[PDB]
Point group: C3
Chain length 231, copies 3
């Protein structure tokens, strides 16, 4: 484990995702509202999945070597197995908050799968220049997601209860800022141009992951928007 300088950030990430999972699990014990139960189930699964994948990276299972640039490059593939399941769950939290229609939910989840799937292909591609073709396709899929979150959901939240509109607006802004950083870290990190070393890259993804999952969840599950209007 300790033979890799980035191990400290993988261990911290593992701990923070595990602690986040347990807090949400305990906090959700005393909840019977069927609407609130939906948000607790979605939001608790997110850091639980991330916990297992951070642990796999810490123990060395989620790491492979990819030859490109005449070098064997360490690629943590477990990140994409994490994101494949956690990013659509996070979008479902937002879509259920605004009572989005089914067709829009399917478009979001499908574009998200394309985003993560093409990012994985780009991470494992051995022809250096082709890695950035996949990065560009994946980034186009992300821009579609961000467009929908702004010019489809925002207008839908305003016609909703005030507390669900204000909570959505906050979580929307958090998501757009944090998610946009991921393609940048990829491009300048060891998967892309190799400007930033792997140990610093790992620290950046850990800060982003914890903020986008645990921080996101703390804002959502403390809001009254997750409960139905009741007397």
């Amino acid at each position: 484990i300790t033979g890799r300088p980035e191990w400290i950030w993988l261990a911290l990430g593992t701990a923070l995702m595990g602690l986040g999972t347990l807090y949400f699990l305990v906090k959700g014990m005393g909840v019977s509202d069927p609407d609130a139960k939906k948000f607790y189930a979605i939001t608790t699964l997110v850091p639980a999945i991330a916990f297992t994948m951070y642990l796999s990276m810490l123990l060395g299972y989620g790491l492979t070597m990819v030859p490109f640039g005449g070098e064997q490059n360490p690629i943590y593939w477990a990140r994409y197995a994490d994101w494949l399941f956690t990013t659509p769950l996070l979008l479902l939290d937002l879509a259920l908050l605004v009572d989005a229609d089914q067709g829009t939910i399917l478009a979001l989840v499908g574009a998200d799968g394309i985003m993560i799937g093409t990012g994985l292909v780009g991470a494992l591609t051995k022809v250096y220049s082709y890695r950035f073709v996949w990065w560009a396709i994946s980034t186009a899929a992300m821009l579609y997601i961000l467009y929908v979150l702004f010019f489809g959901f925002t207008s839908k939240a305003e016609s909703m209860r005030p507390e669900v509109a204000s909570t959505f607006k906050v979580l929307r802004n958090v998501t757009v800022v944090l998610w946009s950083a991921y393609p940048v870290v990829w491009l300048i990190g060891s998967e892309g141009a190799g400007i930033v070393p792997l140990n610093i890259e790992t620290l950046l993804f850990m800060v982003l992951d914890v903020s986008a999952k645990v921080g996101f969840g703390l804002i959502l599950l403390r809001s009254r928007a997750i409960f139905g209007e009741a007397e």
Copy 2:
């Protein structure tokens, strides 16, 4: 790329799926009917997924070598990753058109997963004679799907609006004819008996894919069956 004679058909397929995706995306911009939005989302995702997998084959990522018959045989595995997601989406288009019940939808999607999954196992199997055992199981799963589309959905469409009944009947006939060709191309192509060479096999799958996805989508999204009855 150009070192493979089949590259021209992979490049054409990539272009036609990309163009198809963009047309459906633009055409769906001016749509607010929640029913129509469902069909546009399903139908636009189909060629978008196929685009990415054709590109992976063009660039050489979606290709592996499988030893059988005393030879290293080029097997494009990316086809099955495509079909795993696009064939159930196409069946969902048909099932939603006739307002099929949930139990029937699950049976269709499950049989479809078995069809594609066993076809993938057959494509990667190293014992030559066993490849055709998997082909037979996969073909049995397809025949179940075709039976349901005829002796379960057809009777359901007649009790529906006339425009949804006539549109379903057309898309049903297109699907049964085109899908039935796939097991035949597999059997006589490089995955099976090896009668037809890979470059011709690739041309045939490209014609079938574009027809079953883009051609299918053009018929559906030009129909009024996708809109609810409104004044």
Copy 3:
């Protein structure tokens, strides 16, 4: 095939899953109740999936070698591909029986995916002591599932029709007893401590699989709880 002593139990399992699939398929022909159709579709898919994965193990495709303990250990990975899809389908049978809320269904299916996913990682892990870390995480996920089936569903079934309450109680008890045996067989078998040899381990999993899928299905599909109350 016959070069492996466990082949006899893989062949028996294949036959019993295939026969089970055909019986459920025939029995479900004469069913039009939309509620009953749901249970028949879920319950017939379970042994059909298991059939294909037992066949892959029989023919040698679903087997790999994992080095640990200074030895190349035969690991049947196809079991986890089976369980990944069949265990959530079995939980869906139970959840639909008691009309569970959506949030609870998602929590069950998500915990089940974590259970199977971490068990697969543990089966393929090359550092011997780490294999049991994954076993423990997977077992914690199972205990969560069992808790929900007892202290969330049981109370919900009592407020239901008497026949659905008594049928659920029976299937609940069958599930908790049979599922609990799996982590024990893993721990003492070739994936874990290696006390029980592989051929005996394979026999035990076959008895458990057939009972948990075909036996489970025979109890459910003979009950009147799967039909709506009708005159």
